[PDB]
Design a binder for this molecule. Structure first.
Ligand SMILES: Nc1ncnc2c1ncn2[C@@H]1O[C@H](COP(=O)(O)OP(=O)(O)OP(=O)(O)O)[C@@H](O)[C@H]1O
Lengths: 449, 49, 85
């Protein structure tokens, strides 16, 4: 009985056991915490032999230093070698497992396996949620002792794992017996904010933070929004049925303070893939160029090893470390990125790489644009119609005061992007109610309409 | 490399009985030096008389 | 099963290196976690007694021995706030 890991369980038993039923000397597994490591170590041993001895080895193994583990490590194997040498012909298999792995044991240990004697016919394996398994953790540990739900503290698992969850449950008595002490009526075992935070430290690899890049869901203020989105999502769809374009390169660009970074996250989330990942300079701050490129490899190879996935790279003029005053940048990072865009996926895999650009002209000058394909202009707001419709979608202003700015429809013409505007309404509101709208227009004019 | 590590380490004293108990055997060997000679003393003078 | 019997083992920093791998080549008994580790949970779990610890710098010790079940509890006192002080 194994939750998940069947494809990995499939291949692992054949190559070891299918051959025997030169033979491999040993197999080793690397697994993350919370994987049910010990149960798997039990099961593979059980499956091997009916009653083939299942031997366990301690974490402390090199105890008894006076002069023992040099023997006692050796003796346990030696007994297995002893049994082997006693009767080699009619087929002897002995099992020892050493869980959770200096001078002497390195050469001795390995030597024991292949030294002087053939040493064959034995194997040793080292390993370094299952919410139903976690339910067993309840019904063995919790049953030992308005109750918790049958399932809540098993599905609230993400933050923790049962292997560490053994504190609040022990304290769970104290949760209402701590009367600073005649006895309050016996308790129910009540669970109340006894979920993770009493003892929260644990390992679950959160690493999300994807939503943060988009703080506001994008609002449709205009035909251009639907334009950009449908023009992009037809691409992400045609990859699915694609042939001879496993990579697809797109560069979408607009002027600054026009949110296109969350926008790309929007188009990528909407078309749901196995894998998504986001390359943010925010993450890699203060890194050497050769570390930065390495980072891009490390994510990008993760995307390859999925069957297919899109990824995003944002704000690359900063990723490139560009400055105009005289041009300087890291060249190798650029060239790396550029070769990715022409790098094929291995046999069948396919991906969509997209990228965001404040300024096009610099890169057009750097001849990186041809590697990109089928690019997308995201405009700034041109017109007050679109403006009024935008704040209508949001609803910052009351319609009455909204009249006042409405008084001008193409009284002036606007170059504005959404990000500065969205921050600008906030200061406008911050000022006294007579002058909120008074100042909003003032600043809309401050940037020259 | 450019590596210089020059190091030291500390000693493990084998349990050499680690008690005074050694004395009692040493007391027996005292007494066999001590209590033996007067046998000869009185022996030679017993032989004189 | 009277468990009034407790000890202060202070300054765990010194007695233990996390697995003993720290400081490279060291005496075999320069660190024994293994006996006292084995003592509490190794031979059998002991429910009669409580061990206490003080470390000014925990992070040296923490990964190896503060694995849950050896100690699943870990606590930190910060300095007083204005009313605390
Ligand atoms: N419909 C929309 N169009 C554009 N931006 C929007 C829209 N709705 C919300 N936003 C906001 O725009 C912001 C864009 O942030 P982003 O990282 O794209 O900045 P940016 O525009 O790329 O900045 P710059 O373009 O100057 O580098 C987001 O915080 C998001 O909340």
């Amino acid at each position: 009985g194994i939750g998940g890991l069947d494809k990995e369980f499939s291949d692992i038993f054949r190559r070891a056991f299918a051959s025997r039923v030169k033979h491999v000397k040993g197999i080793l597994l690397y697994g993350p915490p919370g994987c049910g490591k010990t149960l798997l170590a039990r099961q593979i041993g059980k499956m091997l032999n009916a009653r083939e001895p299942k031997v366990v080895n301690g974490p402390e193994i090199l105890n008894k230093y006076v002069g023992e583990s040099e023997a006692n490590i050796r003796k346990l194997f030696a007994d297995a070698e002893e049994e082997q040498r006693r009767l080699g012909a009619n087929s002897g298999l002995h099992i020892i497992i050493f869980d959770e792995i200096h001078d002497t044991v390195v050469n001795q240990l390995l030597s024991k396996i292949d030294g002087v004697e053939q040493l064959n016919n034995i194997l040793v394996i080292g390993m370094t949620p299952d919410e139903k398994g976690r339910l067993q953790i309840l019904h063995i540990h919790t049953a030992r002792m308005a109750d918790v739900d049958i399932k809540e503290l098993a599905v609230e698992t993400k933050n923790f794992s049962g292997a560490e969850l053994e504190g609040l449950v022990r304290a769970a008595q104290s949760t209402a017996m701590n009367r600073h002490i005649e006895s309050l009526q016996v308790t129910r075992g009540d669970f109340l904010a006894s979920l993770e935070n009493d003892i929260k430290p644990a390992f679950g690899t959160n690493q999300e933070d994807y939503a943060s890049y988009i703080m506001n869901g994008i609002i449709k203020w205009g035909d251009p929004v639907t334009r950009v989105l449908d023009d992009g999502e037809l691409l992400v769809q045609q990859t699915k049925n694609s042939d001879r374009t496993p990579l697809v390169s797109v560069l979408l660009e607009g002027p600054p303070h026009s949110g296109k970074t969350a926008l790309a996250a929007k188009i990528a989330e909407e078309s749901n893939f196995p894998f998504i990942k986001i390359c943010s300079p925010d993450k890699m701050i203060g890194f050497s160029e050769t570390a930065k490129c390495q980072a891009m490899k490390k994510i990008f190879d993760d995307a390859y090893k999925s069957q297919l996935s899109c990824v995003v790279v944002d704000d690359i003029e900063r990723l490139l470390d560009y400055v105009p005053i005289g041009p300087r940048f890291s060249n190798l990072v650029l060239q790396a990125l550029l070769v990715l865009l022409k790098k094929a996926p291995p046999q069948g895999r396919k991906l969509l790489i997209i990228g965001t650009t404040s300024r096009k002209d610099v890169l057009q000058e750097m001849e990186m644009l041809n590697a990109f394909s089928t690019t997308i202009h995201v405009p700034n707001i041109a017109t007050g119609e679109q403006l009024l419709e935008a704040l209508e979608l949001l609803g910052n202003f009351k319609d009455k005061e909204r009249t006042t700015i409405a008084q001008q429809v193409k009284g002036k013409k606007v170059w504005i992007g959404i990000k500065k505007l969205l921050m600008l309404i906030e200061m406008s509101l911050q000022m006294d109610p007579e002058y909120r709208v008074r100042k909003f227009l003032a600043l809309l004019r401050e940037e020259g309409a | 490399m450019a590596e210089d590590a020059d190091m030291r380490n500390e000693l493990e004293e084998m349990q050499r009985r680690a008690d005074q108990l050694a004395d009692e055997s040493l007391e027996s060997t005292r007494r066999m030096l001590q209590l033996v000679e007067e046998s000869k003393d009185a022996g030679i003078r017993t032989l004189v008389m | 099963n009277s468990g009034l019997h407790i000890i202060i083992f202070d300054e765990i920093d010194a007695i233990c290196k996390q697995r003993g791998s720290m400081a490279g080549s060291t005496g075999v008994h320069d660190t024994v976690v293994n006996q006292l580790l084995s003592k509490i949970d190794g031979v059998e779990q002991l429910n009669n007694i409580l061990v206490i610890g003080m470390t000014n710098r925990p992070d040296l010790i923490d990964e190896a021995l503060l694995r849950p079940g050896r100690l699943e509890v870990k606590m930190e006192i910060g300095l007083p706030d204005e009313k605390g002080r």
